[PDB]
Subunit: 154 residues, 6 copies
């Protein structure tokens, strides 16, 4: 039992009631890696809402938060800006490894993802890009890294 994890799905349509294509996948992958998943929170691609969702999880003592979406370059891709405000420190290695793995698998939104990763309070927070391939490959890359960091934070 590695810890507690939360999925934050950053998508306007999903926030407004549409089917969630990312939450169950990330839940399945997190559960497989030994996490108990608190649930999935869906938020608009809005800086205030994203920050509030991340901060709420940190205050709540979650071990791992994985966000999905909002890491591209269109106007509304504000997940990295939001995440930057709430991090006490960055673990660049996590974002580099995820980008490196995405690029060589030809998953372009992962290879170029502006997503961040770091520690806020005692919580590891990681932004993943929104595509299903990005989600699968990012989690594959994250598995050994998250266990190590959470163990150190405990």
């Amino acid at each position: 039992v590695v810890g507690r994890a939360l999925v934050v799905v950053v998508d306007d349509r999903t926030a407004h009631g549409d089917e969630d294509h990312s939450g169950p996948l990330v839940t399945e992958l997190l559960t497989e890696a030994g996490f108990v998943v608190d649930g999935v929170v869906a938020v608009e691609a809005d800086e205030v809402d994203i920050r509030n969702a991340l901060n709420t999880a940190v205050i709540g003592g979650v071990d791992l938060v994985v966000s999905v979406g909002g890491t591209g370059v269109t106007p509304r891709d504000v997940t990295p800006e939001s995440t930057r405000e709430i991090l006490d420190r960055e673990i660049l290695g996590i974002a580099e490894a995820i980008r490196a793995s995405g690029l060589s698998a030809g998953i372009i939104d992962a290879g170029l993802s502006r997503g961040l990763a770091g520690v806020s309070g005692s919580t590891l927070v990681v932004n993943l890009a929104g595509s299903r391939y990005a989600v699968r490959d990012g989690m594959a890359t994250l598995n050994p890294l998250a266990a190590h960091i959470i163990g150190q934070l405990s």
Copy 2:
């Protein structure tokens, strides 16, 4: 629709009627990549049985065969030795990319997998290691590569 796929699961306990963990996962991932999955064939870790299952798949005209397991180094891991004889041309780039990806993700049985990849008739054949993480990460790496090869073989 990219083409037709078959899954071969190399495992003694499965071939004797224990629960199959890999077949449904590979099928899920194949279908997601746009393949129609003919089905899953479970085979003992027997050099001849493996080679005949693969050979039956080729003769039957399937576009992609993915095998799972029997690629380590115990006397029983005979998958690469089975597969070698049915291959007309090896595509070393697929096996290398699978291994390099496994290694950076800390997936040791993938990083050290002796699995082959190659063309048999008009069928692309790829051996994956048996761990769940090896299955996931190997399929993520193989996705852009299979599509290209099958396109080239059509």
Copy 3:
């Protein structure tokens, strides 16, 4: 036609009217990637001059600016410092991929390049190191990445 490109060559000897080696190469490579090259602007290694040349390029609506030189570590390599101020968002994945590629090819000024990559307005801006090998290998790495970003920005 993928879009319009500008080349900025950061070099004192060139800005003073010596032969330009990089401009024609970058133009050849840009055109090959499907860009229309507006032209080459030669600038001194002056933090302000560089930043204004880049800024003029952005205001003029060009899709891709590639600069060459001034990304090492002498007091005179001020390209990244110029570029930082005009960037709205950094795309760290481009700079990382350029460096990792340079490093495995033994191209040290590329592997250690302090060059940035990011979005300014609707313009993608990328700093390359100044060696001929750095220009070639950086453009090979950038090709799939620029196309995707400009597509996303349109």
Copy 4:
């Protein structure tokens, strides 16, 4: 002055008089790296002709032979089979590095190239894939490797 080099262009159409799109490029890149280029030989995608062209260059004391084309998976891609017969020993590192670099640059014919590299007599022979991107990225990767091996062979 690193040594003497020969370009072997493996393409049916080019052998039969069509414009050569690869020869001048490889010549330019070889010359840039310090080689004197003997010329370009164009051959059919035929095992006998390819072998004869490679062997002729070896007997002739060429330091480096770069072939271009015939490394894919269609029936007529027989460059690796031809090259295998004439090599005394393989340098797998060259083919791995070229494939690794091609994959992460999204150059699929390079990432999956079945091209070989090795020593025949005192000659380094390297098969590159046929696309212009493959040619450019392969040469970038080959530059430091060829100089090292040729120096050892002397």
Copy 5:
């Protein structure tokens, strides 16, 4: 013939128990590896995992004209892991490619403290400073990666 010497180096060991007189396991190793790469090693300085102490040790080396400072330790995520924060303050500019190469190499060798190291690399005055993680494998692998980079940077300076 000192003709092929690359320059002067200093090792900074960031470790509390070492700062209080416990046997130093990192200093001699980094010294051996620096010397083998052609650096003349001034010595090893032990400091506590304390931002001011780390910062003072680095400033002294910079003021002293040392070409290469390699620190060892204090690059994880616990609260005492303050080497990067101490280092950032004294850097004039960062050389991202060094830290990226150390991490990428660490990750493929299964050296997790190296793969995740928040250690920085960059230039302060004319001094190259590189933070490595504390485990023995991080030190060894970090130095293997640093060898071809440091010498090039110092040459440029």
Copy 6:
């Protein structure tokens, strides 16, 4: 407590001048690195760059029940570089991923003899055999890469 020992190792130094009594620079280093990774080191055996001598040294180790043989040298492209040809003959199967990881790591660290090494890796009976290139940087970097791989292979055997 010998509880966490991974297994027994042997070092084979392939070098002509060392085989004829010149100071061995590789044996002690590989021994140090093997011991640090949890291997108990039987010793170092020096042989000439000769196919029969190399092959005999390897066969003796295999017959002896050694878990890991690391050879050093004879992996380039000159005519005396015969370690891979000697090794291929005694291998039951190859573990391509080891040789690929050593080369990829060597290449990014600018260690060209490692990046281009024709050295093999594989299993002979119950013995893992890995050929490394001869330079000091190849030995160090090769071992950093081998550490997480060897222990896993031996466990499986």
